[PDB]
C-alpha cells in the first residue's frame, strides 16, 4: 500500500508524461522492444518492424503507445482503487494477447528508464521508488487476476 505522498510523486511525474503522451509512448515501447525483442513478437500489427527508425515512423506503434499510457494513467490516478480498470485489461492480456508477468516487468522497466531520462526534475530517487511501488502494485493485482482468469502468466 502506497502512502498519499508516494502517490503524489507518481502523479507529479505522470503530469509531465501527459504533456506529450504520444512521444512518451513511442520512447517507452521502443525501449521495451530494443531491450527485450521477444516482446515485439506479441504485436501482430507491427512485429515486422526492424529498426528504431521504422518504429518511430509507425503511426500504429504511436497509437499503441498512447493506448497503453492512457490506460495506465487512469489506473495510477485511482491510487490503488483500480479493480474496475484492471478487469478488462487483465482479461485481454491474459486471454487474447497472452502477456506473461515477466513482460509486464519489462515494460515497467522501460517506463522507469524513460521517466528517469526525460524527467530528472520529477524523477529523483524518492519519485522512482514511488513509481516502482505503484507499478509493483499494478503487477501484483494483475497477477492475482490472471490466476483468477486461469492464466499462469
Q: Which residues bind ligand HEM (CB under 6 A)?
A: 39, 42-43, 45, 64, 67-68, 71-72, 89, 92-93, 97, 99, 103-104, 107
Distance CA 46, CA 61 (A): 7
Question: Residue 147 contacts by C-beta under 8 Å, 6 or more apart in sequence?
Answer: 153
Binding mask 11-50 vs ligand O=N[O-] (x if CB under 6 A, - otherwise)? -------------------xx--xx---------------
Query: What is each CA distance from 29 to 9, 16, 65, 106, 146, in whole angstroms?
Result: 23, 18, 6, 10, 23
For residues 32 and 39, the answer to whether their CB atoms sit within 8 Å is yes
- Please, what is the minimum distance in Å from the beta carbon of residue 121 to ligand O=N[O-]? 20
Give which of 12, 11, 58 is closest to 33, Cα–Cα. 58
The three cell numbers of residue 85 are 480498470
Partner from ligand HEM, ligand O=N[O-], none binding residue 143, C-beta < 5-8 Å depending on class: none
Pick one of ligand HEM, ligand O=N[O-], none as the site partner of residue 6 (Cβ within 5 to 8 A by kind). ligand O=N[O-]
Site map (CB under 6 A) of ligand O=N[O-], residues 68-87, x = contact: --x-----------xx--xx
Does position 141 interact with ligand O=N[O-] (CB under 6 A)? The reply is yes
Amino acid at each position: 500500500v502506497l502512502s498519499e505522498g508516494e502517490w503524489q510523486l507518481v502523479l507529479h511525474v505522470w503530469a509531465k508524461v501527459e504533456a506529450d503522451v504520444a512521444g512518451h509512448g513511442q520512447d517507452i515501447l521502443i525501449r521495451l522492444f530494443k531491450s527485450h525483442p521477444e516482446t515485439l513478437e506479441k504485436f501482430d500489427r507491427f512485429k515486422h518492424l526492424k529498426t528504431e527508425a521504422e518504429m518511430k515512423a509507425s503511426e500504429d506503434l504511436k497509437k499503441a503507445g498512447v493506448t497503453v499510457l492512457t490506460a495506465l494513467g487512469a489506473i495510477l490516478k485511482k491510487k490503488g482503487h483500480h479493480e474496475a480498470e484492471l478487469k478488462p485489461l487483465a482479461q485481454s492480456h491474459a486471454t487474447k494477447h497472452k502477456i506473461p508477468i515477466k513482460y509486464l516487468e519489462f515494460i515497467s522497466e522501460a517506463i522507469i528508464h524513460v521517466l528517469h531520462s526525460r524527467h530528472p526534475g520529477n524523477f529523483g530517487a524518492d519519485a522512482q521508488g514511488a513509481m516502482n511501488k505503484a507499478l509493483e502494485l499494478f503487477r501484483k493485482d494483475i497477477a492475482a487476476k490472471y490466476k483468477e482468469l486461469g492464466y499462469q502468466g
